[PDB]
Amino acid sequence: PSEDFVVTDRGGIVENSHRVHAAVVDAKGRLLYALGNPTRMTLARSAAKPAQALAILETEGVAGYGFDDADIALMCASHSSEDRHIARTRAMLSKIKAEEADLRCGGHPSLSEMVNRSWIKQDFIPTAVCSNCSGKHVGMLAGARAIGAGTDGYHLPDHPMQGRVKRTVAELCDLDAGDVEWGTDGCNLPTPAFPLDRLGRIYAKLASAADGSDAGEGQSTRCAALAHIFRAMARHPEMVAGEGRYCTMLMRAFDGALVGALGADASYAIGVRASDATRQLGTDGALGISVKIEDGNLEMLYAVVTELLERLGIGSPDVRSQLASFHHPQRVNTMGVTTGGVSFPFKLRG
Amino acid sequence: SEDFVVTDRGGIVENSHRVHAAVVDAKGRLLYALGNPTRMTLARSAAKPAQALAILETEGVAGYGFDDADIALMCASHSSEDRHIARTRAMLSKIKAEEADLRCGGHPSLSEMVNRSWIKQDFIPTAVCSNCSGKHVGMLAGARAIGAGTDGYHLPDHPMQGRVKRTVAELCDLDAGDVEWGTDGCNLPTPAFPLDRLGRIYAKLASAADGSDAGEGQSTRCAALAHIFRAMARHPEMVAGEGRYCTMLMRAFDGALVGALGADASYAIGVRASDATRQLGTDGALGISVKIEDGNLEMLYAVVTELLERLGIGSPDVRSQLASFHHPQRVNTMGVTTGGVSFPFKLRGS
Ligand SMILES: [Cl-]
Ligand SMILES: [Zn+2]
Ligand SMILES: [Zn+2]
């Protein structure tokens, strides 16, 4: 497993190499395939957002605000700060009678180079509603208001909204509280770390809940909420990230068969609804995939995730070809000459 | 040897980066190491002083009257500031060439501050803006000086590139077959060789400067190497630019060493003999070369600065000018410190 790498070359000469870790799990979290160390203790960063959205949606009273599926997809989002994302953030603040000054996240350069270039041309200074995490933050303000906890300090560990987040994360992971560690995210919220396979487990449970809903099975309130989060992400993938973004292009290509989301510093998680491909992989239910590039390189992350989907047989060559520019990153110099490429000397193990 | 620089979020491991380093004496003998000090490595722009030597040794180039700042630009990966473009143009005029003779292409500036001003003006960079433009003018100079014609000066079959290839292997003390060649972002042949030989090149620069200063008899080659060292140290803003690590490093040391970046996170430093180098157990100059395996530049500058502190090169006051690179900021969008950088590696002798 110490040999699982993605490697870039220049004229066949090794340039950089990147250690890969991955877990492929069933709906109960049993490990089916791995790369690297599948239990690596890993900060999930923004890939935890579906679990935080579950804590929001399980907060009594939040249903009264009338958030719709696109709002819930924005809670699940690391969005590009496109004008539609900012506008929806402001519209969600109005639903809870809050204002931009109540947010405790900060502005940052857009995750999209094209958006950021427009901002630079305009001397635009991003503010709190422009945060890629702005939907999650409005959701947590919503829950704070709904239980009467006060919006001041909704982002601090001592607040009941964060106590709810912390218990919800551990429960979805099937871990004791002491086995989840906490830091602080760029958006200024508590953010969890846990073994990488458990990030796969969370997304397997998302997809499993979607399968149960679609088949008409009786569900707990939790499974119904998980099915709702899956549906929202898959129905509004442009809210989850934006134009040209991997997460958006991936979920559009698969048209409801899976959901996926990025974690900052190069983690990724995918929940796959039961299919011919999942059955061929040896399980009778939904499937979860999680990935971490040890050194944090995002370009390599998206190449590896796409390569892994091909090796697992998920989708078809035609579906996955929508991701070709991520799968095989361009290596072209300033005069248009191809100078190298990207290779995948790793081996899936069962 | 498992040597890493490790970033954390709240003490939880975020990313880790494998480090390779060689510390060599003036004859290339290995004194200290991290990782694999003989890793086959693409030197990229850190090879520029060897390419400048090939230029300066070309018959007739002396008649063009290149000065020290011109030679510093030949050795540069500059930020494309207005002064770098103006010097490139002055060098083209010295050889009666024009911008359309260049065979490098434009690219987003290596400086974020420069790139933002370009984006604001809708400026599209051209050949004269290349971070390698000084090297390219020098190659055009050599091609013209021997009557080989400017057309195709960048191609492997051109006599200028034959001179570069030979000069690189000679400075490395390697046979031609032990240097591999690809194509750079700037569309020139670019060499790969064991990482320690990159340190050997820079040790030879600093040794030549020591010998020029001590008034030793010198070959034409050692005299030119001494000139290259002097030029980089006298004009470190030409080698890179405002705010750049290479510039701030050489300014802080005020002639005691030179250093330059290789794209995809290699670094090389040539250290003139000093109380520090004697304390490390050599009676001459010293060379340092570093590669971050995954290509991360931020981690490269942190590691190089930590290495200078471990090796005792400079004073605490001198190295404090590099504090922002040594321990990069880890502060979120709300001004809260969220993490840090650590150096759990240990330098081994021999
Ligand atoms: Cl390139
Ligand atoms: Zn966040
Ligand atoms: Zn170049």
Author numbering:
A (entry chain A): 3 to 352
B (entry chain B): 4 to 353
Q: Please, what does the article write about this entry?
A:
ReAV is a homodimeric protein, with each subunit containing a highly specific zinc-binding site created by two cysteines, a lysine, and a water molecule. Two Ser-Lys tandems (Ser48-Lys51, Ser80-Lys263) are located in the close proximity of the metal binding site, with Ser48 hypothesized to be the catalytic nucleophile.
The zinc cation nearly fully occupies the metal binding site, with a refined occupancy of 0.8, shared with the coordinated water molecule. As observed in the previously described mutant structures, a sulfate ion (derived from the crystallization solution and present at 0.7 occupancy) is bound near the zinc cation, forming H-bonds with the main-chain N atoms of Gly188 and Cys189, the Nη atom of Arg47, and several water molecules, one of which is part of the metal coordination sphere. As observed in the S80A mutant structure, the side chain of Cys249 exhibits a chemical modification, modeled as S-hydroxycysteine. This leads to stereochemistry that is suboptimal for the nucleophilic attack and prevents activation by the basic Lys51 side chain.
